[PDB]
Design a protein around this ligand. Structure first.
Ligand SMILES: NC(=O)c1ccc[n+]([C@@H]2O[C@H](COP(=O)([O-])OP(=O)(O)OC[C@H]3O[C@@H](n4cnc5c(N)ncnc54)[C@H](O)[C@@H]3O)[C@@H](O)[C@H]2O)c1
Ligand SMILES: [Zn+2]
Lengths: 264, 52, 213, 97, 98, 212, 50, 69, 99, 123, 109, 49, 92
RNA sequence: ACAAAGAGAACGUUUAUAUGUAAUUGUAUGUUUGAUUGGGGCAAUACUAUAUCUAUUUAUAUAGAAAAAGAACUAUAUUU
């Protein structure tokens, strides 16, 4: 990892004065010391890389608004922001200007760039059909837009319109309810579904680039699938195929006159 | 251990389902009074024991 | 060479001659579908011969059955079935779990219907759902079970409900595992579904590899 | 590990939202190529969950405050009824489900 | 321990301990003696919550007493005499989670 | 000889035996409590001193749990009356190696403490710091610079009650600890995991488009 | 003080037989529980007409 | 009768998993020790893995040289 | 007439180079010669000696005698362990069953 | 459960049973095991009500109580007695059902050829 | 025990009651070291199910001195090296010199 | 020598007439159990005629 | 027991044990078959630098196929005995 | 006991790797007298070892090794 040149020794005076095998050589507590110390000294030389684990993942398309991909995301964070969209939406693009002239234009781009960072990449990781991508345009475009596509090839625009008084910490939440609304509305207003039921069940994984720091989830791919495992207590399926008893349907209520009375 | 305790009183008389190997061929006059009084005793000796 | 593990399908043989001998003798009533309660309570078979699972009807030298005879037994032999079925009878092979074996022999201890669990998976493979024995689930299996969930794709045809909103592999390690498997096995049609390449050699996961149909 | 099913009733510390989180059936590490450390600490750890998360930090995501933390107090299900039965019918909509 | 409450023979016979094929509620109440037990099942209660105690806990229903509905064995035994009696079990059934 | 044999421990209820010893604080090993005060008073007496509304409060069955030892199963229903072995297990099982690594605990500093060697702050006043387990015990606590960061320590000082889960679980292996560091890095120092801190790198222009 | 005041090898009559039930055994106080007399076992089981 | 048609036999391209000349081959019971259970790839290796066990029972597969075994 | 048929002697150790038509005499269920039939089946006869009309114990447990133990007038009250519970499939428990 | 001709619930498969009312059966063996079973339920009530008649004055002091502890008698009534009534009822139906058929057979048969040969045809 | 690569958690045994020998002793609460017993008598699966631990205190509890919180001297049955002899030994806990500062009595103790 | 399958000499082994006509796909112990269920039918067809 | 190496009739030579005298003629048709074969003196001595080959009934295929020699110890169908795919001169 | 590791290593424990005649366990043969142990053959279709010699004359099982029909390792070569 570039820090694996641990000196196979350590300053510590060897306990066990006498003699024997295993003396004066590194310990797995000391091997983690030098690993951290010489990790920091790179992290000052800036040569230290964090794409050492994420070597198989296809390196995301670099772009100036697409820094959301190169971030190593905490798996305990992508669990919190569990956003889901209608499955027939193939992609989401969120473009926004670089510098925004009007004061309310800088408001929206803040929301876009926020939603470009906060809510877009969880949707990728959670839904895995959508190809979430964000690009920062370069001009005084005081309004960002969102291109919510769909599997049928159709698509819409979602003019990112936050209110002047609101913050951006909810301006996205509005935009969120402005996208996940459309996604179902587009997916409800689709044409014949037999085709998109094939593409969707053919669309490869779009979220491969996503870099998830599986923190305290490193035991086995069982817990790496912990966001797909979804407990469902009180599950309800009350539609039984009842098979009634046609032959001798009566005759349960007509027998064993218990201990025949005085007449018989 | 398990000794068929659900059979102690579930016999038709008092001398039944009580294992008494101590028998004899001819139980005499007072050995028979001793016997009949015996079966009922360890039938009421058992009960009021188990009731107390 | 003849071991009996926990769950073996080894029946005690009730020769059809015995059952046919009784029905005329008068121990068994030909009207009432002769479930194993009647056989046990009429002293046709004792306690020392009904060990789970119940019995097996064997057409032993019985070249003919004269009257329409109805039976609810466990795993009749194929000839014994085609003998009752010729004389207008029936044979609906009940293959009850052990919990069902009790509540059929001593129902005077179960005042109400205490629900019965379906038999072991090994039994459902061979008797309970197999129409060759007219197992009692050969109606249900084709009617309700053999159909997948109305949302399941190709990979999740066996889950009670498709665990994803899309048939395809969910995450990377479910994918690269299936991207390697489908070319680990030479590219077969269904080889997409990753399978464990180690055979436990258990008797439960054993179903008739060769046999009649 | 785990072999038997059990559902706990975890009480958050931030909102005290008594949410229940179960523990499914996760099969034993393979005995065919046995490994003494991974097994005997799978088992000993299993008594520690089976006794209501004795020596473990509980890490499940809340349902009320949507976030994952480690602040849950594992309620034995007669300390839960002590709590559930003693909440006005409106706060049962607030803290319970 | 100089005195053991029970010899190992009865630390190792779970049949006297577990609830398996063994009734754990002795008294069988009448019709009106149940409609007067369920009167104290409080509103907000649901059988879907009182769980099965583990094996290591004895199977003992001390009967219908104060807060009997939390005794998992008293609850599901009363719930069963309400069947043989015909009383209408309002509360929910054991929801086997999946 | 015993003049005045003491009365049973928790005999305070009028028509039910006192809970077994051990549960009240005494000697374990016996399941069923019994108090000769209760068994001698005839039945009508026990029904005199009590009304029906009360017996339903002391009949009360707290079935698995114990009403007294809060959080532990009632010791008249366990396999044997001793305390639950499983909950109070010794930290080392019968075979494992003692590789319990160095653990750092949270302490509430009580005076603005300022190191003169790193020239920075061990800790501000009234802020909880994760310090070594043998700095705290040996250097921070004996002098009055710090105390532990327990729940009640917060209560005594005037701070919003925070649950650090101080030693809620000890890790018996380094990599079993370096997972616990990842849990505690999330709950305690949460600002590390905001969408704003994962993007200090990018709050403005991607650096390749700025001046020089 | 709650203990019984003799080495329990002398009072082993109580610990192994079916006196394990008829006796208080809390912290080795081998003292008899309450026990009805036979004038009462029938006074309490006839008044019920059992 | 019903004119329904079914073949005479089911041909499965499956291969038998018990070869008479292979040692641990067979169909084992659902609770027998699966093929080479506890062995860990070594001859009688489940013995060598006993010292590795954390704690064993008081009566645990001890010394027993096959004498009149 | 109860043979105790046993498999071939040399069927796993050394195969390469042995005769071509004797590498298969190892495959038949041959009887063991009666001089050993009587030795091994001697430990089974002892079950009730001097009773000239009880047959020897069998090698495998025949299906009717297993129940013969629980077909005794004293076992009629053990619902469990009757009608075959060991050789039954593994019991099924409450989904909450736990130890 | 089976135990009568109604078919156990294992007619989940809708196995019908046609060609019925086909057999006159005198219920010979079943009436035998009824008189045997009716003797048990009465031979059980005799036990459930055994009450001390101590013909001796030594242990006369229980001459009013039942011969079984109240908890046990309260069990044996429910374990063995009330079971034996169900087992008696079962035969009280497997016969009351089979008679219903015979009542129908012995009419449709009496007509055809003879009311004299009839109880010879069914002899 | 199942053989698939990725076994997602589930309510019940997905493929029937878990097969294998060691799954047989876990299905009854025992620990996986029961697989190494030669005799599993009704006392044995009692002995090793840890109903009541075979584990005691070095001195009398009424006369104990060093603060043993919840510990015993549990005996660890070891099986020896190449020739597997079974021997057992009593393993203690690790007592440290607890040199604390109880600020009640403003001094180390 | 050092062969395993000596040519068909006079031995009444499995139905070699049907060992030729059968899919090699199936394993052995599942073939010799299936050339018989083929032959078992060829025996019924012959008896009926 | 000791006595690990026997001493009565230590045979001069011994055909089965010689650097490659017993060879598993595994089938070139990667059906996993093998037919253990001791190289005779015609190949015991290195008359063959080439790895032995023979035509033998492949009992699986029921066809005479090649038998390339190979050490008798080893898995006989490894991921090296996969043949690269090829489109046959048949088909459209 | 020696060494490793873990505890800001305040000292007691637990491990791992090691196995000490300080270690008290068990083996240390059998047959003819000190050598021999195998399967054949010639010596009246006798064979004590008699007398001679030969040689792919083969080392059964159980765990591992080879997973289709095919296969390896070793034991006074009946082999506790
Ligand atoms: N293998 C078995 O478990 C088994 C065997 C024989 C009988 N049973 C039947 O089980 C029934 C009880 O149900 P379960 O098996 O779930 O266990 P259970 O006995 O715990 O059932 C709950 C409770 O129902 C009550 N009850 C049972 N039968 C009753 C009756 N006839 N009238 C009134 N109350 C009654 C008892 O209090 C019992 O404890 C009994 O009626 C019994 O005859 C079960
Ligand atoms: Zn919360």
């Amino acid at each position: 990892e570039q820090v694996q040149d641990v000196p196979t020794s350590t300053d510590r005076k060897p306990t066990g004065m006498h003699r024997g095998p295993g003396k004066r050589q590194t310990a797995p507590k000391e091997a983690a010391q030098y690993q951290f110390i010489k990790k920091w000294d790179l992290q000052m030389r800036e040569t230290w890389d964090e794409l050492e684990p994420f070597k198989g993942l296809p390196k995301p398309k670099v772009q100036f608004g697409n820094e959301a991909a190169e971030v190593i995301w905490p798996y305990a964070l992508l669990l919190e922001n569990v956003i889901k969209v209608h499955p027939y939406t193939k992609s989401i693009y969120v473009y926004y200007s670089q510098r925004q002239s009007t004061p309310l234009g800088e408001l929206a781009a803040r929301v876009a760039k926020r939603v470009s960072q906060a809510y877009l990449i969880p949707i990728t990781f959670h839904n895995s059909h959508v190809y979430v991508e964000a690009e920062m345009l370069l001009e005084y475009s005081e309004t960002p837009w969102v291109v919510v596509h769909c599997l049928d090839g159709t698509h819409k625009l979602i003019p990112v319109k936050p209110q002047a008084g609101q913050t951006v910490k909810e301006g996205a939440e509005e935009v969120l309810n402005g996208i996940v609304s459309a996604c179902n509305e587009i997916g409800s207003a689709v044409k014949n579904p037999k085709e998109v039921m094939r593409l969707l069940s053919e669309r490869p994984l779009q979220n491969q680039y996503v870099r998830v720091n599986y923190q305290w989830y490193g035991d086995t791919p069982e817990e790496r699938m912990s966001h797909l495992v979804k407990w469902d207590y009180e599950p309800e399926e009350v539609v039984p195929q009842l098979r009634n008893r046609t032959q001798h349907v009566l005759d349960w209520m007509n027998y064993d006159g218990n201990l025949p009375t005085h007449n018989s | 251990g398990f000794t068929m305790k659900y059979k102690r009183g579930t016999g038709l008389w008092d001398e039944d389902h009580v294992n008494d190997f101590d028998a004899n061929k001819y139980l005499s006059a007072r050995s028979t009074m001793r016997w009949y009084y015996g079966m009922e005793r360890l039938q009421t000796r058992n009960n009021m024991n188990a009731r107390r | 060479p003849r071991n009996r593990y926990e769950g073996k399908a080894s029946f005690s043989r009730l020769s059809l001659s015995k059952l046919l001998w009784a029905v005329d003798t008068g121990r068994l009533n030909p009207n009432e579908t002769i479930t194993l309660y009647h056989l046990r309570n009429a002293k046709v078979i004792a306690d020392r011969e009904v060990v789970w699972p119940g019995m097996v009807l064997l057409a032993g030298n019985v070249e003919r059955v004269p009257y329409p005879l109805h039976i609810e037994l466990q795993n009749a032999s194929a000839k014994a079935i085609q003998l009752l079925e010729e004389a207008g009878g029936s044979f609906t092979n009940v293959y009850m779990s052990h919990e069902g074996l009790y509540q059929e022999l001593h129902p005077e201890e179960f005042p109400t219907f205490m629900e019965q669990e379906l038999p072991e998976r090994k039994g459902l493979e061979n008797f309970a759902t197999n129409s060759r024995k007219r197992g009692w689930l050969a109606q249900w299996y084709e009617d309700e079970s053999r159909y997948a969930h109305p949302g399941a794709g190709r990979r999740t045809a066996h889950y009670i409900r498709p665990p994803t909103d899309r048939d395809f592999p969910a995450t990377i390690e479910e994918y690269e595992l299936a991207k390697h498997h489908q070319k680990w096995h030479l590219n077969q049609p269904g080889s997409a579904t990753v399978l464990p390449w180690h055979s436990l050699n258990t008797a439960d996961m054993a179903r008739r590899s060769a046999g009649r149909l | 590990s785990n072999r038997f099913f059990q559902k706990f009733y975890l009480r958050c510390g931030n909102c005290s939202a008594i949410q229940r989180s179960a523990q499914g059936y996760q099969p034993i590490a393979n005995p065919i190529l046995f490994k003494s450390d991974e097994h005997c600490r799978n088992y000993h750890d299993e008594q520690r969950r089976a006794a209501g998360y004795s020596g473990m930090v509980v890490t499940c995501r809340c349902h009320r405050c949507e976030r994952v933390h480690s602040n849950w107090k594992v309620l034995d299900a007669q300390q839960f009824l002590d709590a559930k039965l003693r909440m006005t019918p409106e706060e049962r909509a607030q803290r319970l489900w | 321990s100089t005195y053991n409450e029970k010899s190992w023979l009865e630390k190792a016979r779970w049949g006297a301990f577990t609830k398996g094929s063994r009734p754990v509620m002795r008294q069988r109440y009448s019709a009106a003696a149940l409609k007067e037990a369920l009167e104290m099942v409080p509103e907000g209660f649901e059988t879907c919550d009182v769980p099965r105690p583990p094996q290591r806990i004895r199977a003992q229903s001390e009967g219908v007493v104060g807060r009997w509905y939390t005794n998992y064995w008293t609850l599901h035994s009363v719930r069963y005499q309400c069947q043989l009696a015909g009383v209408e079990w309002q509360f929910g059934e054991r929801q086997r989670p999946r | 000889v015993a003049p005045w044999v003491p009365p049973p421990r928790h005999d305070v209820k009028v028509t039910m035996p006192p809970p077994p010893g051990g549960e009240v604080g005494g000697s374990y090993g016996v399941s069923t409590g019994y108090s000769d005060r209760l068994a001698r008073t005839p039945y009508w007496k026990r029904m005199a001193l009590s009304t029906y509304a009360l017996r339903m409060k002391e009949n009360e069955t707290r079935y698995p749990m114990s009403p007294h030892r809060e959080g532990e199963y009632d010791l008249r229903y366990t396999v044997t009356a001793y305390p639950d072995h499983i909950k109070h297990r010794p930290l080392l099982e019968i075979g494992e190696a003692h590789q319990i690594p160095t653990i750092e605990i949270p302490v509430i500093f009580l005076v603005n403490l300022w190191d003169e060697e790193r020239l920075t702050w061990f800790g501000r006043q009234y802020e909880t710091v994760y310090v070594n387990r043998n700095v705290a015990r040996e250097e921070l606590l004996p002098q009055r610079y710090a105390i532990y960061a327990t729940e009640e320590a917060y209560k005594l000082l005037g701070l919003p009650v925070v649950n650090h889960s101080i030693h809620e679980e000890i890790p018996k292996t380094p990599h079993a600890y370096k997972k616990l560091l990842e849990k505690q890095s999330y709950t305690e120092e949460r600002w590390k995991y905001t969408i704003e801190y994962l993007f200090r790198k990018y709050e403005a222009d991607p650096p390749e488009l700025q001046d020089k | 003080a709650r203990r019984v005041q003799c080495p329990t090898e002398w009072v082993h009559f109580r610990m192994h037989t079916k006196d394990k039930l008829k006796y208080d055994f809390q912290d080795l106080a081998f003292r008899k529980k309450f026990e009805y007399s036979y004038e009462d076992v029938v006074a309490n089981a006839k008044d019920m007409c059992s | 009768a019903s004119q329904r048609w079914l073949p005479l036999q089911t041909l499965k391209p499956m291969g038998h998993n018990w070869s008479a000349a292979t040692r641990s081959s067979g169909v084992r019971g659902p609770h027998m020790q699966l093929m080479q259970e506890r062995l860990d790839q070594k001859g009688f290796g489940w013995k060598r893995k006993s010292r590795s066990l954390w704690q064993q029972d008081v009566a645990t597969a001890g010394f027993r040289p096959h004498r009149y075994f | 007439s109860r043979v105790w048929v046993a498999l071939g002697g040399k069927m796993r150790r050394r195969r390469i180079g042995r005769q071509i038509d004797v590498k298969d005499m190892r495959y038949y269920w041959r009887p063991i010669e009666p001089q050993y039939q009587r030795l091994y089946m001697s430990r089974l006869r002892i079950k009730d000696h001097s009773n000239k009309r009880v047959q020897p114990m069998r090698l495998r447990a025949t299906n009717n005698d297993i129940g013969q133990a629980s077909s005794l007038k004293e076992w009629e009250r053990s619902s469990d362990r009757k009608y075959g519970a060991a050789l039954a499939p593994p019991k099924k428990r409450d989904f909450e069953f736990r130890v | 459960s089976g135990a009568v001709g109604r078919g156990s619930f294992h007619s989940v498969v809708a196995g019908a049973n046609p060609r019925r009312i086909p057999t006159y059966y005198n219920s010979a063996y079943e009436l035998i095991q009824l008189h045997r079973a009716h003797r048990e339920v009465t031979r059980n009530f005799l036990v459930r009500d055994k009450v001390f008649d101590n013909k001796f004055p030594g242990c006369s002091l229980a001459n009013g109580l039942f011969k079984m502890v109240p908890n046990k008698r309260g069990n044996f009534h429910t374990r063995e007695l009330t079971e034996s009534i169900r087992h008696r009822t079962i035969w009280g139906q497997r016969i009351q059902q089979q008679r219903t058929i015979n009542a129908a057979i012995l009419e449709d048969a009496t007509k055809v050829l003879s009311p004299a040969q009839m109880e010879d045809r069914f002899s | 025990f199942s053989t698939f690569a990725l076994n997602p958690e589930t309510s019940r045994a997905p493929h029937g009651p878990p097969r294998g020998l060691i799954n047989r002793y876990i299905s009854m609460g025992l620990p996986p070291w029961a697989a190494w017993c030669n005799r599993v008598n009704r006392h044995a699966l009692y002995r090793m199910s840890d109903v009541s631990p075979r584990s005691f205190l070095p001195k009398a509890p009424h006369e104990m001195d060093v603060i043993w919180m919840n510990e015993r001297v549990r005996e660890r049955v070891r099986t020896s090296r190449q020739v597997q002899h079974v021997y057992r030994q009593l393993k203690y806990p690790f007592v440290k010199t607890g040199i604390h500062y109880s600020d009640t009595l403003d001094h180390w103790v | 020598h050092h062969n395993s399958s000596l040519p068909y000499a006079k031995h009444d082994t499995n139905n070699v007439l049907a060992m030729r006509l059968f899919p090699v796909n199936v394993g052995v112990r599942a073939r010799t159990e299936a050339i018989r269920i083929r032959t078992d039918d060829c025996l019924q067809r012959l008896r009926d005629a | 027991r000791l006595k690990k190496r026997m001493v009565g009739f230590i045979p001069k030579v011994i055909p089965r044990k010689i650097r490659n005298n017993m060879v598993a003629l595994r089938s070139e048709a990667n059906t996993g078959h093998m037919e253990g074969y001791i190289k005779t003196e015609a190949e015991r001595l290195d008359a063959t630098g080439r790895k032995l080959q023979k035509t033998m009934w492949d009992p699986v295929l029921q066809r005479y196929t090649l038998m390339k020699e190979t050490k008798v110890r080893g898995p006989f169908l490894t991921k090296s005995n996969i043949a690269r795919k090829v489109d046959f001169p048949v088909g459209a």
